[PDB]
Amino acid sequence: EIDDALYSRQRYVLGDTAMQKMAKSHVFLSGMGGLGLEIAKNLVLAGIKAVTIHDTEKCQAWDLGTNFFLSEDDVVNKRNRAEAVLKHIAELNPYVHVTSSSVPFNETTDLSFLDKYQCVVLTEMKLPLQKKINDFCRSQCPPIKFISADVHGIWSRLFCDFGDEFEVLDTTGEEPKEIFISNITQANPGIVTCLENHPHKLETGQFLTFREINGMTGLNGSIQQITVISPFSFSIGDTTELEPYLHGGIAVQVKTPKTVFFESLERQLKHPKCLIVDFSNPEAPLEIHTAMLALDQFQEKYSRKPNVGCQQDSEELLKLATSISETLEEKPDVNADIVHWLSWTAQGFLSPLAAAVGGVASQEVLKAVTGKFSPLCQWLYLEAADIVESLGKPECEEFLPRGDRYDALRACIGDTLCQKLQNLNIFLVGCGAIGCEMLKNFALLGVGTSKEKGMITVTDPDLIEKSNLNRQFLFRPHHIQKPKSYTAADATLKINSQIKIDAHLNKVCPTTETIYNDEFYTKQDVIITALDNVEARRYVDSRCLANLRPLLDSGTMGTKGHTEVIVPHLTESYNSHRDPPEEEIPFSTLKSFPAAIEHTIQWARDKFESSFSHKPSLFNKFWQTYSSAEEVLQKIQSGHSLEGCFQVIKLLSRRPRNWSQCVELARLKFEKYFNHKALQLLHCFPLDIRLKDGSLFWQSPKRPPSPIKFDLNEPLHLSFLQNAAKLYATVYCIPFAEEDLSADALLNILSEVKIQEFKPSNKVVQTDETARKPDHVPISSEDERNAIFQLEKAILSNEATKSDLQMAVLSFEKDDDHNGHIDFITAASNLRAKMYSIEPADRFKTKRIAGKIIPAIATTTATVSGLVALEMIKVTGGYPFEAYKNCFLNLAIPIVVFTETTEVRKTKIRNGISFTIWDRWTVHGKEDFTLLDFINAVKEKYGIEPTMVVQGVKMLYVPVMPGHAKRLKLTMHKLVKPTTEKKYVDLTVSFAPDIDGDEDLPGPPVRYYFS
């Protein structure tokens, strides 16, 4: 079986069905350039059972700028490129069998040996050989999935060919959407209306199956094609033959395979299916395809690449391209600038672009070997011409090789910019997979190597986990339970010994802001984030905005990913981005009316939290508050309203003392959860109960629950009982052995267990969606008397010692199998599912949902890292606003979207006075500067009067407060008493609305200086 323990996220990303094909899979790859190296890293991280790399060339000092595994001695010994790194390749995954070859490739070379590979990847060989290879593989039975990837300086090319036909099992990879049926009409085609505010996002031609229909019992399980009518209506073919529609009904999306017809490589040369990544230039892919075809023709003609600055070579290439365009089907325009840049950067090689294209190539290889997603069809082109376009006309002397390990980079971008990279200061936040790939990018880029100014700072407080070995490739098995940052720094220094770097074990937060003060940010030049949560991102945004520093953001959600670029005075902010929050599940829905397995999953998560962390913590905190039980009793007798008294007293009263007591407590909890709750619900609302309009109360989406009889013979019952018993024993520190949860031992204790009889009673029920968690209703004195009797019996039994008040609060772990938390949550969720007869779910899905695990894969990480590095270079160049390109992509399609970053805004306030997010106003006064003096200072310095004052969150002035509007006569040093941490104070004030009736209009924050 798959080693899920390491693979983790990938399982959700792809599906174990696909994983069954990563086993038994055999992949060939040749060329072993930098691009080939990145592709190989991605593939080994993916988990291909067998990989055969191949190369014929040996090590050069030039290659040191493109390979991380390479050492100087490898070039010293003139070793073959593939061989010098094959050993390191095996380090990534023992489960992968990787092999190398050096058999020469030529026009007379036999190819039949390649039959043992499902997919073949080609880099760095001449085009005609590629043509022959494509012919052979696509002529094989079955045709062999062919992929050619190439990089030249600041350019790339990606192509795929899976034969004349390819069966894509899943086009999108999304979950099958579920729709609640509101109305059905007997028609041909029958019109079906969903619930209002429930957009269905269908397309005409899709297919769909149904279940639980009132009326058409026959349509349950039937499959129909659909034509969309409205966002909540559509057609499903003839339905007149059947009953009237009664109610209910569920729409389950049905996925179907699709066929993609890849054409031959050579024919695709004259008819390239170029995908578009920039709508503003839907012709650029065609032009670049022509340009590099002309380059290939030049290399064929001269057996060499053009010399940089050799205008003769550029003119020849331009003539060649001019010739080629006419041969094309469309005969598009010719870009002389593109030809010039190709000739200018032919000899170079760009590492980040290589990483990005390699990630995409690995994704296409996975699609080829799985069919899990619609692959590229057929061409793709990526470029970095923006970078060199900003440089105007630099001379070839900037790009001349100088012997160092960055000669190729110098050829790509020029020596001056290379030096700029060498002297940067980067404060990378978080060291997740994205962070690690980033550090690899700088290490290849020589960033910060200059002892003069280069100083790379990264902080991360977490430790290396086994699952993280799937993606954070810089780490090794013997590094688990060790700081991510230290391991990453050591690996980076191994990659490039010249690098200047520092690490930290800190977590970024306002508490640690003392370390990461404003001056530290001033030291920093570019800030990159690799976070996982949103609020931390917003906090970092606020800090960088206060520090006027550029920031880069990225995120990877499975096949999808996004990059955000923010530049001072040019772009908006991540805070300016205001994405809506999640879709709240009503408190009533979660507590009483589940309809989807996710509801029960969250419910079980919350119940676990309350049962094993929250309530135990309340218990422990209470006993810290109060020394002894006698004191508590005397207080309560004297009317002391001690918080949580009832719940805590009930807890200790039901506190077990032995393993059998743990088992019976678990049994009682099971009865309460899955029998008595449903019974009480039914008592409150019988099955026949109906709404005021007369329709059924127990209609969709509400599901009438059905109580469940216990039986240890049911695997679910036994598992739940075991998990609950173990958790409770851990709570009460009850010693135990693994023989205790043997089923026979359990039922032995269970045989004499007296099951309490259910008893309904009147209870307050919230049902409305917006009806939310009610506050504590005051409790009758009768229950206080009950609790008093309980603690009386406890003290009389002397079951009140300090140890009797000691208990170990649990912490929710999700990655370890032996804490049982995942098992318990799975048992509870499945039980609740059957409780309402809702569809069950597997353990792993429950773990993902409850743990809020975001699926991630190596390829998306590498690709976004490449793009982020590119944007970092663009930042370093100080390029104008137009160059930077915010990127969003969904490799599931696959699709790459390039767009200009959102421009900054001049927020006008009054009479044309406009301020951007980058504007922080300031005022200088003295110790006597009162609040009103500050009002006047604002009014004079920016022509606007304040109307309320907040220091951070401190409401310092508002007209609706009578007793504190007098603060106007008070200087801040005595009014707010600013902290000694700052020479200044940072504020935010809104002003009188121009619309009299509206609220105060916010303005830029102000840093006031006391002198």
Ligand X SMILES: Nc1ncnc2c1ncn2[C@@H]1O[C@H](COP(=O)(O)OP(=O)(O)OP(=O)(O)O)[C@@H](O)[C@H]1O
278: left (phi > 0), else alpha (psi -120 to 50), else beta? Answer: beta
Rounded to whole angstroms, the Cα distance separating 629 from 802 reads 10
Q: Which of 49, 494, 635, 650 binds ligand IHP (CB under 6 A)?
A: 650
CB atoms within 10 A of CB 222: 14
**From ligand IHP, ligand X, none, which one binds at residue 647 (CB under 5 to 8 Å depending on kind)?**
ligand IHP
**From ligand X, ligand IHP, none, which one binds at residue 150 (CB under 5 to 8 Å depending on kind)?**
none
To ligand X, the closest distance from the beta carbon of 467 in angstroms equals 6
Q: Which stretch binds ligand X (CB under 6 A): 100-108, 524-532, 579-587, 755-763?
A: 524-532
To ligand X, the closest distance from the beta carbon of 180 in angstroms equals 32
Residue 980 DSSP symbol: T
Nearest alpha carbon to residue 361 among 162, 158, 161? 158
Pairing of strands 551-557, 526-529: parallel
Q: Which stretch binds ligand X (CB under 6 A): 246-254, 424-432, 700-708, 927-935?
A: 424-432
Q: Which stretch binds ligand X (CB under 6 A): 219-227, 243-251, 501-509, 868-876?
A: 501-509
To ligand IHP, the closest distance from the beta carbon of 692 in angstroms equals 24
What string of H, E and C letters represents the secondary structure of 158-205? Answer: EEEECCCCEEECCCCCCCCCEEEEEEECCCCCCEEEECCCCCCCCCCC
**From ligand X, ligand IHP, none, which one binds at residue 650 (CB under 5 to 8 Å depending on kind)?**
ligand IHP
Q: Which of 214, 233, 542, 647 binds ligand IHP (CB under 6 A)?
A: 647
Taking the least distance from each CB to ligand IHP, the nearer of 703 and 920 is 703
Q: Which whole-number Å values give the CA distances from 846 to 126, 176, 408, 764, 819, in the listed order?
A: 50, 17, 49, 31, 16
What string of H, E and C letters represents the secondary structure of 430-494? Answer: CCCHHHHHHHHHHHHHCCCCCCCCCEEEEECCCECCCHHHHCCCCCCHHHCCCEHHHHHHHHHHH
Half-sphere exposure of 726 (CA within 13 A, CB side): 18
To ligand X, the closest distance from the beta carbon of 475 in angstroms equals 11
Rounded to whole angstroms, the Cα distance separating 321 from 296 reads 10
Taking the least distance from each CB to ligand X, the nearer of 384 and 531 is 531
> According to the binding rule CB under 6 A, does residue 536 interact with ligand X?
yes
Q: Which stretch binds ligand X (CB under 6 A): 528-536, 722-730, 749-757, 913-921?
A: 528-536
Which parts of 747-786 interact with ligand IHP (CB under 6 A)? 763
Contact string (CB under 6 A) for ligand X, positions 466-485, x = contact: -xx---------------x-
CB atoms within 10 A of CB 620: 15
Q: Cα torsion for 512, 516, 519, 520, to the nearest 10°?
A: 160
**From ligand IHP, ligand X, none, which one binds at residue 468 (CB under 5 to 8 Å depending on kind)?**
ligand X
To ligand IHP, the closest distance from the beta carbon of 604 in angstroms equals 10
To ligand X, the closest distance from the beta carbon of 356 in angstroms equals 19
Q: Which stretch binds ligand X (CB under 6 A): 384-392, 459-467, 689-697, 970-978?
A: 459-467
Residue type for position 9? R
Q: Which of 248, 272, 375, 430 binds ligand X (CB under 6 A)?
A: 430
Taking the least distance from each CB to ligand X, the nearer of 66 and 459 is 459
Question: What are the contacts of 693-702 at 24+ separation with CB within 8 A?
Answer: 695/247, 696/247, 699/247, 699/248, 700/180, 700/181, 700/212, 700/247, 700/248, 700/249, 700/250, 700/595, 701/180, 701/593, 701/595, 702/593, 702/595
Q: Which whole-number Å values give the CA distances from 577 to 77, 156, 417, 564, 568, in the listed order?
A: 54, 32, 32, 10, 15
The residue with tokens 């000691």 is 806
To ligand X, the closest distance from the beta carbon of 681 in angstroms equals 36
Q: Which of 168, 382, 384, 531 binds ligand X (CB under 6 A)?
A: 531
**From ligand X, ligand IHP, none, which one binds at residue 591 (CB under 5 to 8 Å depending on kind)?**
ligand IHP
Q: What residues contact 490, with CB distance under 8 A and at least 6 apart?
A: none
Which parts of 741-770 interact with ligand X (CB under 6 A)? none
Q: Which stretch binds ligand X (CB under 6 A): 351-359, 504-512, 656-664, 816-824?
A: 504-512
Rounded to whole angstroms, the Cα distance separating 503 from 347 reads 36
Pairing of strands 227-230, 155-161: unpaired
Specify the DSSP element, H or E, that contains 252: strand 247-254
Residue type for position 887? C
To ligand X, the closest distance from the beta carbon of 41 in angstroms equals 16
**From ligand IHP, ligand X, none, which one binds at residue 508 (CB under 5 to 8 Å depending on kind)?**
ligand X
> According to the binding rule CB under 6 A, does residue 591 interact with ligand IHP?
yes
DSSP-derived 3-state class of residue 213: strand
**From ligand X, ligand IHP, none, which one binds at residue 255 (CB under 5 to 8 Å depending on kind)?**
none
To ligand X, the closest distance from the beta carbon of 435 in angstroms equals 7
Whether 464 and 475 have beta carbons less than 8 Å apart is answered as yes
Residue 393 DSSP symbol: S
Residue type for position 285? P
Whether 264 and 134 have beta carbons less than 8 Å apart is answered as yes
To ligand X, the closest distance from the beta carbon of 143 in angstroms equals 37
Q: Which of 318, 508, 725, 833 binds ligand X (CB under 6 A)?
A: 508
Taking the least distance from each CB to ligand X, the nearer of 318 and 469 is 469
Rounded to whole angstroms, the Cα distance separating 10 from 58 reads 35
The residue with tokens 């005969």 is 331
Taking the least distance from each CB to ligand X, the nearer of 293 and 530 is 530
> According to the binding rule CB under 6 A, does residue 854 interact with ligand X?
yes
> According to the binding rule CB under 6 A, does residue 507 interact with ligand X?
yes
CB atoms within 10 A of CB 514: 9
To ligand IHP, the closest distance from the beta carbon of 647 in angstroms equals 6
To ligand IHP, the closest distance from the beta carbon of 703 in angstroms equals 16
**From ligand IHP, ligand X, none, which one binds at residue 526 (CB under 5 to 8 Å depending on kind)?**
none
Residue 274 DSSP symbol: B
Taking the least distance from each CB to ligand X, the nearer of 553 and 664 is 553
Contact string (CB under 6 A) for ligand IHP, positions 604-623, x = contact: ---x--xx------------
Q: Which residue number has the CB closest to ligand IHP?
A: 610
> According to the binding rule CB under 6 A, does residue 433 interact with ligand X?
yes
Taking the least distance from each CB to ligand X, the nearer of 131 and 538 is 538
**From ligand IHP, ligand X, none, which one binds at residue 432 (CB under 5 to 8 Å depending on kind)?**
ligand X
To ligand X, the closest distance from the beta carbon of 853 in angstroms equals 6
Taking the least distance from each CB to ligand X, the nearer of 41 and 677 is 41
**From ligand X, ligand IHP, none, which one binds at residue 431 (CB under 5 to 8 Å depending on kind)?**
ligand X
Helices 311-327, 336-344: axis angle to 10 degrees equals 130
Rounded to whole angstroms, the Cα distance separating 177 from 25 reads 32
Q: Where are the alpha helices (DSSP H) in 645-696?
A: 645-653, 659-671, 677-684
To ligand IHP, the closest distance from the beta carbon of 590 in angstroms equals 8
Taking the least distance from each CB to ligand X, the nearer of 134 and 487 is 487
Pairing of strands 1006-1009, 921-924: parallel
Whether 222 and 192 have beta carbons less than 8 Å apart is answered as no
Tell me, rounded to whole angstroms, the distance of Cα 523 from its chain centroid: 30
To ligand IHP, the closest distance from the beta carbon of 962 in angstroms equals 41
> According to the binding rule CB under 6 A, does residue 461 interact with ligand X?
yes
**From ligand IHP, ligand X, none, which one binds at residue 703 (CB under 5 to 8 Å depending on kind)?**
none
Point out which residues bind ligand X (CB under 6 A). Answer: 430-433, 459-462, 467-468, 484, 507-509, 530-532, 536, 853-854
Point out which residues bind ligand IHP (CB under 6 A). Answer: 591, 607, 610-611, 647, 650, 672, 763
